[PDB]
Amino acid sequence: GSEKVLIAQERSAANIVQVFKKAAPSPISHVAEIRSALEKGSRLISTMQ
Amino acid sequence: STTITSGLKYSLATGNWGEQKKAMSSRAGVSQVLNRYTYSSTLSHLRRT
Amino acid sequence: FGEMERDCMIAHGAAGFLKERLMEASDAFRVHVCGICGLMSVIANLKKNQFECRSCKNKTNIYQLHIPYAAKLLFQELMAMNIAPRLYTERSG
Amino acid sequence: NDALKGNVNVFSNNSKFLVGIVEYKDLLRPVKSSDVKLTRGSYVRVKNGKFKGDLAQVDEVLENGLEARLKLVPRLDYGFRPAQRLFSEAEARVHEPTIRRDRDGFVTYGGEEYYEGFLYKTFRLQNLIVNSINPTLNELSLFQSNEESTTIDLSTIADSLKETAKNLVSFQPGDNVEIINGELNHLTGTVSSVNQSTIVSVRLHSDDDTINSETVEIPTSDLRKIFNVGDHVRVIHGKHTDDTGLIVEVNGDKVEFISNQTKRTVIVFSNYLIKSTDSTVSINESGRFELHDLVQVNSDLVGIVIRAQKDSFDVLC
Amino acid sequence: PQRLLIPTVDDPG
Amino acid sequence: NFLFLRSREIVENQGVFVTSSNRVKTI
Amino acid sequence: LEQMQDELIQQLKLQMEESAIRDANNIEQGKPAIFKLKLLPKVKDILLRANLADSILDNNLLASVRLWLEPLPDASLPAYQIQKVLFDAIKSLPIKTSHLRESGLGKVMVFYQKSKRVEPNLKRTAEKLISDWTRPIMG
Amino acid sequence: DGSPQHIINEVEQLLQFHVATYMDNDIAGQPQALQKSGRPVKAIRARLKGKEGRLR
Amino acid sequence: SQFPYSSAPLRSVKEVQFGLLSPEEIRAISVVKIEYPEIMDESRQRPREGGLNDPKLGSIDRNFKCQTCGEGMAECPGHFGHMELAKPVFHIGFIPKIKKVCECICMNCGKLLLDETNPTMAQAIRIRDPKKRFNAVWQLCKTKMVCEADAPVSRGGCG
Amino acid sequence: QGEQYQEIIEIFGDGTDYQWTLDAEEEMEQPTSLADVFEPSELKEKMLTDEDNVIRVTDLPE
Amino acid sequence: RERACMLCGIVLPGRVFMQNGCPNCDSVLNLRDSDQATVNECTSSSFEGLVAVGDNEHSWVAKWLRVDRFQPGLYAVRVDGRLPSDIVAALEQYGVYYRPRDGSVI
Amino acid sequence: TARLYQHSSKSSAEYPNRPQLAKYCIGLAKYIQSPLLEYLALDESMYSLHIHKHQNLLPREKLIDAVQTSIVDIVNLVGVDINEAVRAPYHALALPYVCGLGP
Ligand SMILES: [Zn+2]
Ligand SMILES: [Zn+2]
Ligand SMILES: [Zn+2]
Ligand SMILES: [Zn+2]
């Protein structure tokens, strides 16, 4: 008997390469991360850096 | 059938978007009570992210 | 009456008002303490008018204090964790 | 791994460990050996049923071992349970004339077999307490009255006395104790510290100063409390429970003391005494009278309760 | 006997 | 007509002494 | 070095035997055994010293340990402190079959295991020690 | 009754865990003690710390 | 004047002395021993004696009175019980301190690994503050990894 | 094997060195007077004392 | 319904004991040729410590339970009840000594 | 005697499932049926009754002796049926007060 509304959740897109700069107190200087999702069902599977 | 029925009902009623026993460390506020103070507020709540 | 209001009353210098706010307008409680062990382990029967700390085995060196009920709860919770907070009514040096 | 392969009761993780070789004998050692078997004639307590808690004599032990026929005190109303009482054949006939008879002294009433006023009914093994049995003089007298000799049997009763005397002894620091066995037999000492319930550190008292500065840990099974004349002692257990007073006469095992509440001499065994310098007796949850109650003494007398006691009151007219 | 049957190192684990 | 009174200084019977109401004056 | 330790341990052995004889005589004369308790701290400190274990096994102090553990003819057990200290020392030292043969402590160990006035913890430790000592014989 | 040392170690570690999580249920590097509902147990330590604690 | 009269004199707190509770003190201040896990006697009110809601521990009900002090719910402060453990366990808050003390002393003969003969140890002794004194003593004796049977003349060390 | 069995007998004994001690211990472990079974204040109430037998046997009104 | 044979220690259903007898003790007990009373006196349904043995010859457990000369199957560490005096005397006539598995004898 | 009977543990054991007022009614009926036995059932409580106005001036032993001699006189006047006293413990209360007998 209570009216409930679903709020849209904002997420980052999958299957795109994103390159970022790690900060100074770290041996890593740059990282290239991609998150992979199958087209059928649109569900996250694995992350590779 | 009580598994799917109770899971969907719990998640929509409480807003915790996961299993009931997994409520800790789970996304909350995905579902909210619809605002009905005025018509414009209902429209705004239905178009929120 | 939060912490910032307490600091403002300290800055005004009104100690009596602060004491009245935190005790008379709130959880004011009365406890009995042994004069030897300093623990809240006295068994007082006020209408029978008999006081006794069974541990220290004394019936005469017993006092009453007015403390917040939350302070009593804190001391009992500390005692539950094997800590011994002993309240004495005189200084030593 | 091959043996556990194909089984579903085994958990997901390989929770296997190497059993130590010494543990091999322990893994197959038997249990419940304390009691070879149930002995006929012993007195036991009933776990559940309508006779829950009543002491029963083991007249017969069934060879199966799951049940046993027992001698009990009947609980009937003859037409929430009635108090135990010896089976009265006359009252049973008056309230129910359908009694059956099979022998002399063996009476069957309501489908239950009563022998000379005592019920004989089979009870399962899972319905009995065969250890830590606490006997009462009333039930003992009621069971041995039919043998024309009062409590003629006293071996199991003496064993129950020994068990109660051993378990009821609790020690505190500063208590004066005496040693019964060992090389330190017939020595006096004061309890310094108590660790667990079987090791007690005792500082002995003797004419030599160098011995008096030593602490010895002594088992509680070889300690007997020392009660000096003129000490405040509080009764642990018995009919005179929570009575305090000053010791007057020490007749070895039996100690006599003038009470504080009744203010009269009371004779209680030394096993039931703890040296408590103050009474601090609370009279709450007793009698029918709060302190300072205005009580009607009789038809034309009234008063106010001044002091309250366990089984008496002080009234100011 | 019973005492002689106590385990040894070469017995199965 | 009897009043049962509780008092601090009469330690003999824990303060309880019996007097008639005609003997007392209210404060 | 080792010879001084051997001499000191032999002197301790003679003192322990003398104390045991004195306590037995006092018990026969109606007096409690006090000399063993008095000598107990020094014996405990010596036994806790790990490097003296070889010298103890060379001088066969376990014979006097058995003598202290031996119940007196009046069927009275020794003080619990003595039994606990000696059991702890036995655990702390690597007793072998040759040392047991020299001392004959197995008889007293079997007596302690079979007895009922002995504490059950001491009973379990005696069972464990008997099992450990029977272990090398069969393999 | 009977003492296989492994079972003694298991049950005594269970007792140690219960006594430790009765006083401090925020122990780092080990799972928290949980209620039947899945919420963590409220220990004595958590009653005394934070804005809503006993002191503040 | 909102509290019932008591003949005990009224004083204020001048000092708070902290410390640990000894097992003797825990047994002495207790009023009952807790050994029965079942909260309720027979699910028919009247909670079981020796349980976690023993009536001697205090009354939290309007119509019932504490069986230890006899006072009502408003006046009774509550009373402690004790629970004997079958085996000793660590206090979770003191485990690193137990570790540091174990480092500081000798596991066989309960003595500090170093004595006052070392001048640094004497200086560590001199500081009055217990925390800093413990810190200094620990910083010294942590290095020492062997008990000394004789003086670095026997100091009682087991070696 | 027989030789190691004899060695075990020599090391651990047959028990006869302390079998008599064990027998003495079992004898002293094993052991009626109503004055010691119940309290005198309970004996008196139950009329179980000697004085009650004296009253009951004497040929006079109680 | 299962019962544990007191003598050899094997565990089999009571109806199996009645119809076919004990496969190991049949040379000295004649359980199959015996009435229900003798079966009850030699096979007890109350037991503890179920044991499954695969290889009698090399299993130290089988030697410890003295079942290494018997048929593999279900065995019990402890069996409630003892053999009667007449059956014990009959076994002593055959020259076979009976060692109780009740645990009370050790 | 009814007001003391209703609180006595003997009455409570006799009628466990009954309230106090039922025990009061039973005490009144028993008093109507036999006053003497109802007075005897009080045991030590019958010395606290209102016997005489100035009964408090006597020593306790004197009052007990006077009450006991009165009971002995009245019971021997009435007489005791020995078989009923042997069977019914309620009627056996008057047997110790028979001439020549005692508790
Ligand atoms: Zn104190
Ligand atoms: Zn209270
Ligand atoms: Zn050391
Ligand atoms: Zn068989």
mmCIF file of N, CA and C in Angstrom, chain C:
data_model
loop_
_atom_site.group_PDB
_atom_site.id
_atom_site.type_symbol
_atom_site.label_atom_id
_atom_site.label_comp_id
_atom_site.label_asym_id
_atom_site.label_seq_id
_atom_site.Cartn_x
_atom_site.Cartn_y
_atom_site.Cartn_z
ATOM 1 N N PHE C 1 21.640 19.815 25.318
ATOM 2 C CA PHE C 1 22.674 20.763 25.713
ATOM 3 C C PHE C 1 24.005 20.148 25.296
ATOM 4 N N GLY C 2 24.422 20.431 24.069
ATOM 5 C CA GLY C 2 25.607 19.833 23.493
ATOM 6 C C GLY C 2 26.907 20.335 24.095
ATOM 7 N N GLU C 3 27.999 19.955 23.425
ATOM 8 C CA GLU C 3 29.335 20.314 23.900
ATOM 9 C C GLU C 3 29.645 21.787 23.666
ATOM 10 N N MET C 4 29.187 22.349 22.543
ATOM 11 C CA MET C 4 29.468 23.749 22.239
ATOM 12 C C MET C 4 28.760 24.684 23.210
ATOM 13 N N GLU C 5 27.531 24.336 23.597
ATOM 14 C CA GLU C 5 26.817 25.085 24.624
ATOM 15 C C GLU C 5 27.532 24.997 25.966
ATOM 16 N N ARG C 6 28.107 23.831 26.263
ATOM 17 C CA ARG C 6 28.912 23.665 27.466
ATOM 18 C C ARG C 6 30.135 24.576 27.438
ATOM 19 N N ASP C 7 30.804 24.675 26.285
ATOM 20 C CA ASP C 7 31.951 25.573 26.161
ATOM 21 C C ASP C 7 31.545 27.032 26.302
ATOM 22 N N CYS C 8 30.379 27.404 25.772
ATOM 23 C CA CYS C 8 29.894 28.771 25.939
ATOM 24 C C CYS C 8 29.591 29.085 27.403
ATOM 25 N N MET C 9 29.031 28.122 28.138
ATOM 26 C CA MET C 9 28.787 28.347 29.560
ATOM 27 C C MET C 9 30.084 28.385 30.363
ATOM 28 N N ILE C 10 31.104 27.635 29.938
ATOM 29 C CA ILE C 10 32.430 27.764 30.547
ATOM 30 C C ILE C 10 33.004 29.152 30.288
ATOM 31 N N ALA C 11 32.856 29.650 29.059
ATOM 32 C CA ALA C 11 33.352 30.982 28.717
ATOM 33 C C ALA C 11 32.619 32.079 29.480
ATOM 34 N N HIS C 12 31.339 31.872 29.803
ATOM 35 C CA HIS C 12 30.641 32.819 30.664
ATOM 36 C C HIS C 12 31.094 32.735 32.115
ATOM 37 N N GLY C 13 31.688 31.618 32.528
ATOM 38 C CA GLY C 13 32.095 31.436 33.904
ATOM 39 C C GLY C 13 30.999 31.008 34.848
ATOM 40 N N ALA C 14 29.850 30.579 34.334
ATOM 41 C CA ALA C 14 28.699 30.210 35.157
ATOM 42 C C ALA C 14 28.776 28.719 35.466
ATOM 43 N N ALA C 15 29.480 28.385 36.549
ATOM 44 C CA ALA C 15 29.645 26.985 36.927
ATOM 45 C C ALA C 15 28.372 26.414 37.537
ATOM 46 N N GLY C 16 27.667 27.209 38.343
ATOM 47 C CA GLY C 16 26.439 26.742 38.969
ATOM 48 C C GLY C 16 25.346 26.408 37.977
ATOM 49 N N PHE C 17 25.180 27.250 36.952
ATOM 50 C CA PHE C 17 24.196 26.979 35.907
ATOM 51 C C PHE C 17 24.534 25.705 35.152
ATOM 52 N N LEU C 18 25.814 25.501 34.839
ATOM 53 C CA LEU C 18 26.235 24.296 34.132
ATOM 54 C C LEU C 18 25.974 23.046 34.961
ATOM 55 N N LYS C 19 26.290 23.101 36.256
ATOM 56 C CA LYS C 19 26.038 21.969 37.136
ATOM 57 C C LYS C 19 24.546 21.677 37.256
ATOM 58 N N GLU C 20 23.725 22.724 37.369
ATOM 59 C CA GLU C 20 22.279 22.537 37.473
ATOM 60 C C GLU C 20 21.691 21.963 36.192
ATOM 61 N N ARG C 21 22.118 22.470 35.030
ATOM 62 C CA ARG C 21 21.687 21.919 33.747
ATOM 63 C C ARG C 21 22.039 20.447 33.627
ATOM 64 N N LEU C 22 23.285 20.095 33.924
ATOM 65 C CA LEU C 22 23.711 18.725 33.689
ATOM 66 C C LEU C 22 23.285 17.754 34.783
ATOM 67 N N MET C 23 22.818 18.232 35.938
ATOM 68 C CA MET C 23 22.379 17.310 36.981
ATOM 69 C C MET C 23 20.900 17.437 37.317
ATOM 70 N N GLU C 24 20.423 18.616 37.726
ATOM 71 C CA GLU C 24 19.042 18.731 38.195
ATOM 72 C C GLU C 24 18.043 18.650 37.046
ATOM 73 N N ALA C 25 18.395 19.193 35.885
ATOM 74 C CA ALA C 25 17.535 19.126 34.712
ATOM 75 C C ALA C 25 17.753 17.858 33.902
ATOM 76 N N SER C 26 18.483 16.898 34.450
ATOM 77 C CA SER C 26 18.875 15.696 33.731
ATOM 78 C C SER C 26 18.989 14.565 34.751
ATOM 79 N N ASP C 27 19.746 13.527 34.403
ATOM 80 C CA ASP C 27 19.818 12.291 35.184
ATOM 81 C C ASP C 27 20.624 12.471 36.470
ATOM 82 N N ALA C 28 19.975 13.010 37.496
ATOM 83 C CA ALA C 28 20.602 13.105 38.811
ATOM 84 C C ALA C 28 20.373 11.806 39.565
ATOM 85 N N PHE C 29 21.446 11.252 40.125
ATOM 86 C CA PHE C 29 21.387 9.958 40.789
ATOM 87 C C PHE C 29 22.228 10.001 42.054
ATOM 88 N N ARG C 30 21.872 9.159 43.020
ATOM 89 C CA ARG C 30 22.578 9.054 44.287
ATOM 90 C C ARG C 30 23.108 7.637 44.442
ATOM 91 N N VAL C 31 24.399 7.517 44.762
ATOM 92 C CA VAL C 31 25.055 6.233 44.961
ATOM 93 C C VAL C 31 25.789 6.265 46.293
ATOM 94 N N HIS C 32 26.131 5.077 46.780
ATOM 95 C CA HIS C 32 26.946 4.913 47.972
ATOM 96 C C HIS C 32 28.274 4.277 47.590
ATOM 97 N N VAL C 33 29.354 4.745 48.206
ATOM 98 C CA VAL C 33 30.695 4.255 47.910
ATOM 99 C C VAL C 33 31.388 3.871 49.206
ATOM 100 N N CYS C 34 32.132 2.770 49.163
ATOM 101 C CA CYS C 34 32.969 2.383 50.285
ATOM 102 C C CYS C 34 34.104 3.381 50.462
ATOM 103 N N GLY C 35 34.419 3.697 51.717
ATOM 104 C CA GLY C 35 35.528 4.587 51.992
ATOM 105 C C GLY C 35 36.895 3.958 51.905
ATOM 106 N N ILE C 36 36.969 2.645 51.695
ATOM 107 C CA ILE C 36 38.233 1.919 51.639
ATOM 108 C C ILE C 36 38.571 1.514 50.207
ATOM 109 N N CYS C 37 37.708 0.718 49.573
ATOM 110 C CA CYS C 37 37.964 0.289 48.207
ATOM 111 C C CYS C 37 37.558 1.333 47.178
ATOM 112 N N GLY C 38 36.742 2.307 47.565
ATOM 113 C CA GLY C 38 36.289 3.333 46.646
ATOM 114 C C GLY C 38 35.392 2.851 45.532
ATOM 115 N N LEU C 39 34.812 1.665 45.662
ATOM 116 C CA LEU C 39 33.944 1.101 44.641
ATOM 117 C C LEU C 39 32.485 1.283 45.017
ATOM 118 N N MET C 40 31.631 1.254 43.998
ATOM 119 C CA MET C 40 30.189 1.345 44.174
ATOM 120 C C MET C 40 29.591 -0.023 44.479
ATOM 121 N N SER C 41 30.135 -0.716 45.479
ATOM 122 C CA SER C 41 29.710 -2.060 45.840
ATOM 123 C C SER C 41 29.023 -2.103 47.198
ATOM 124 N N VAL C 42 28.611 -0.947 47.718
ATOM 125 C CA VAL C 42 27.913 -0.907 48.993
ATOM 126 C C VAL C 42 26.488 -1.407 48.791
ATOM 127 N N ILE C 43 26.016 -2.234 49.717
ATOM 128 C CA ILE C 43 24.654 -2.748 49.702
ATOM 129 C C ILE C 43 23.890 -1.976 50.769
ATOM 130 N N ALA C 44 23.107 -0.995 50.339
ATOM 131 C CA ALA C 44 22.408 -0.091 51.240
ATOM 132 C C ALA C 44 20.927 -0.426 51.268
ATOM 133 N N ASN C 45 20.397 -0.622 52.469
ATOM 134 C CA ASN C 45 18.965 -0.764 52.709
ATOM 135 C C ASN C 45 18.577 0.446 53.547
ATOM 136 N N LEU C 46 18.074 1.488 52.876
ATOM 137 C CA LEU C 46 17.901 2.791 53.514
ATOM 138 C C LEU C 46 16.845 2.761 54.611
ATOM 139 N N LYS C 47 15.739 2.049 54.387
ATOM 140 C CA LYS C 47 14.702 1.968 55.412
ATOM 141 C C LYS C 47 15.105 1.057 56.567
ATOM 142 N N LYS C 48 15.936 0.043 56.307
ATOM 143 C CA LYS C 48 16.544 -0.726 57.383
ATOM 144 C C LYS C 48 17.743 -0.025 57.995
ATOM 145 N N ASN C 49 18.304 0.968 57.292
ATOM 146 C CA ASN C 49 19.375 1.847 57.782
ATOM 147 C C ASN C 49 20.640 1.036 58.071
ATOM 148 N N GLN C 50 20.995 0.167 57.128
ATOM 149 C CA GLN C 50 22.182 -0.671 57.245
ATOM 150 C C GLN C 50 22.975 -0.629 55.945
ATOM 151 N N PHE C 51 24.253 -0.286 56.049
ATOM 152 C CA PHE C 51 25.158 -0.188 54.917
ATOM 153 C C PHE C 51 26.319 -1.149 55.132
ATOM 154 N N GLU C 52 26.829 -1.714 54.040
ATOM 155 C CA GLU C 52 27.876 -2.721 54.144
ATOM 156 C C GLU C 52 28.575 -2.889 52.805
ATOM 157 N N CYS C 53 29.902 -2.798 52.821
ATOM 158 C CA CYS C 53 30.746 -3.258 51.723
ATOM 159 C C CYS C 53 31.283 -4.626 52.121
ATOM 160 N N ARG C 54 30.713 -5.677 51.526
ATOM 161 C CA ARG C 54 31.051 -7.050 51.905
ATOM 162 C C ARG C 54 32.513 -7.378 51.616
ATOM 163 N N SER C 55 33.039 -6.894 50.487
ATOM 164 C CA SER C 55 34.438 -7.119 50.129
ATOM 165 C C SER C 55 35.390 -6.581 51.195
ATOM 166 N N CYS C 56 35.367 -5.266 51.421
ATOM 167 C CA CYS C 56 36.216 -4.647 52.433
ATOM 168 C C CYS C 56 35.797 -4.975 53.859
ATOM 169 N N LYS C 57 34.591 -5.519 54.051
ATOM 170 C CA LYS C 57 34.105 -6.030 55.338
ATOM 171 C C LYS C 57 33.951 -4.899 56.357
ATOM 172 N N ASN C 58 33.389 -3.773 55.921
ATOM 173 C CA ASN C 58 33.229 -2.601 56.766
ATOM 174 C C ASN C 58 31.804 -2.075 56.670
ATOM 175 N N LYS C 59 31.337 -1.483 57.772
ATOM 176 C CA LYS C 59 29.986 -0.953 57.866
ATOM 177 C C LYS C 59 29.940 0.524 58.229
ATOM 178 N N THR C 60 31.081 1.155 58.500
ATOM 179 C CA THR C 60 31.102 2.510 59.036
ATOM 180 C C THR C 60 31.692 3.553 58.102
ATOM 181 N N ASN C 61 32.656 3.189 57.257
ATOM 182 C CA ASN C 61 33.309 4.146 56.370
ATOM 183 C C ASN C 61 32.627 4.079 55.005
ATOM 184 N N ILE C 62 31.452 4.699 54.920
ATOM 185 C CA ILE C 62 30.629 4.691 53.716
ATOM 186 C C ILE C 62 30.044 6.085 53.526
ATOM 187 N N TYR C 63 30.088 6.584 52.290
ATOM 188 C CA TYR C 63 29.627 7.921 51.946
ATOM 189 C C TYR C 63 28.610 7.828 50.820
ATOM 190 N N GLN C 64 27.885 8.919 50.595
ATOM 191 C CA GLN C 64 26.975 9.021 49.464
ATOM 192 C C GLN C 64 27.425 10.142 48.535
ATOM 193 N N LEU C 65 27.303 9.907 47.233
ATOM 194 C CA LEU C 65 27.648 10.886 46.219
ATOM 195 C C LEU C 65 26.443 11.177 45.339
ATOM 196 N N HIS C 66 26.423 12.374 44.762
ATOM 197 C CA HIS C 66 25.448 12.747 43.744
ATOM 198 C C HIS C 66 26.191 12.833 42.418
ATOM 199 N N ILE C 67 25.914 11.892 41.524
ATOM 200 C CA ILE C 67 26.603 11.804 40.239
ATOM 201 C C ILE C 67 25.553 11.604 39.159
ATOM 202 N N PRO C 68 25.876 11.927 37.903
ATOM 203 C CA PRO C 68 24.961 11.592 36.811
ATOM 204 C C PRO C 68 24.774 10.088 36.683
ATOM 205 N N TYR C 69 23.562 9.690 36.282
ATOM 206 C CA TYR C 69 23.289 8.279 36.043
ATOM 207 C C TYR C 69 24.143 7.725 34.910
ATOM 208 N N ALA C 70 24.465 8.555 33.914
ATOM 209 C CA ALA C 70 25.350 8.115 32.845
ATOM 210 C C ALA C 70 26.762 7.857 33.353
ATOM 211 N N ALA C 71 27.205 8.606 34.366
ATOM 212 C CA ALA C 71 28.502 8.334 34.983
ATOM 213 C C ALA C 71 28.498 7.002 35.727
ATOM 214 N N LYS C 72 27.402 6.708 36.434
ATOM 215 C CA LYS C 72 27.228 5.411 37.081
ATOM 216 C C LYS C 72 27.260 4.282 36.059
ATOM 217 N N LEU C 73 26.559 4.468 34.937
ATOM 218 C CA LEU C 73 26.556 3.485 33.860
ATOM 219 C C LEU C 73 27.948 3.300 33.268
ATOM 220 N N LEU C 74 28.682 4.401 33.068
ATOM 221 C CA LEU C 74 30.043 4.327 32.546
ATOM 222 C C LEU C 74 30.963 3.556 33.480
ATOM 223 N N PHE C 75 30.870 3.824 34.785
ATOM 224 C CA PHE C 75 31.704 3.110 35.748
ATOM 225 C C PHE C 75 31.357 1.624 35.792
ATOM 226 N N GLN C 76 30.071 1.286 35.676
ATOM 227 C CA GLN C 76 29.688 -0.125 35.672
ATOM 228 C C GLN C 76 30.141 -0.830 34.395
ATOM 229 N N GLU C 77 30.069 -0.150 33.245
ATOM 230 C CA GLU C 77 30.587 -0.726 32.007
ATOM 231 C C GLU C 77 32.101 -0.905 32.049
ATOM 232 N N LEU C 78 32.820 0.059 32.637
ATOM 233 C CA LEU C 78 34.260 -0.107 32.839
ATOM 234 C C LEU C 78 34.563 -1.295 33.744
ATOM 235 N N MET C 79 33.804 -1.449 34.830
ATOM 236 C CA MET C 79 33.954 -2.609 35.708
ATOM 237 C C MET C 79 33.699 -3.916 34.971
ATOM 238 N N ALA C 80 32.738 -3.920 34.039
ATOM 239 C CA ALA C 80 32.488 -5.107 33.231
ATOM 240 C C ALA C 80 33.686 -5.481 32.356
ATOM 241 N N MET C 81 34.519 -4.509 31.989
ATOM 242 C CA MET C 81 35.739 -4.761 31.232
ATOM 243 C C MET C 81 36.977 -4.892 32.117
ATOM 244 N N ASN C 82 36.794 -5.233 33.396
ATOM 245 C CA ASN C 82 37.831 -5.535 34.392
ATOM 246 C C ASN C 82 38.638 -4.317 34.825
ATOM 247 N N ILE C 83 38.223 -3.118 34.461
ATOM 248 C CA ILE C 83 38.859 -1.894 34.935
ATOM 249 C C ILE C 83 38.210 -1.511 36.257
ATOM 250 N N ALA C 84 38.998 -0.951 37.177
ATOM 251 C CA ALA C 84 38.518 -0.593 38.509
ATOM 252 C C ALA C 84 38.608 0.915 38.710
ATOM 253 N N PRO C 85 37.541 1.661 38.424
ATOM 254 C CA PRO C 85 37.543 3.093 38.748
ATOM 255 C C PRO C 85 37.102 3.344 40.179
ATOM 256 N N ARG C 86 38.013 3.832 41.012
ATOM 257 C CA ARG C 86 37.773 3.987 42.443
ATOM 258 C C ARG C 86 37.571 5.459 42.763
ATOM 259 N N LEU C 87 36.438 5.778 43.373
ATOM 260 C CA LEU C 87 36.071 7.150 43.695
ATOM 261 C C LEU C 87 36.348 7.414 45.167
ATOM 262 N N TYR C 88 37.264 8.339 45.440
ATOM 263 C CA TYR C 88 37.638 8.702 46.793
ATOM 264 C C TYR C 88 37.245 10.148 47.059
ATOM 265 N N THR C 89 36.872 10.425 48.305
ATOM 266 C CA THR C 89 36.392 11.741 48.691
ATOM 267 C C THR C 89 37.450 12.572 49.399
ATOM 268 N N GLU C 90 38.707 12.133 49.387
ATOM 269 C CA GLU C 90 39.810 12.892 49.960
ATOM 270 C C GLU C 90 41.019 12.770 49.048
ATOM 271 N N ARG C 91 41.898 13.762 49.128
ATOM 272 C CA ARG C 91 43.152 13.742 48.396
ATOM 273 C C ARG C 91 44.242 13.079 49.228
ATOM 274 N N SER C 92 45.295 12.638 48.540
ATOM 275 C CA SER C 92 46.414 11.955 49.177
ATOM 276 C C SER C 92 47.703 12.761 49.127
ATOM 277 N N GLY C 93 48.094 13.238 47.950
ATOM 278 C CA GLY C 93 49.304 14.029 47.816
ATOM 279 C C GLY C 93 50.122 13.693 46.587
#
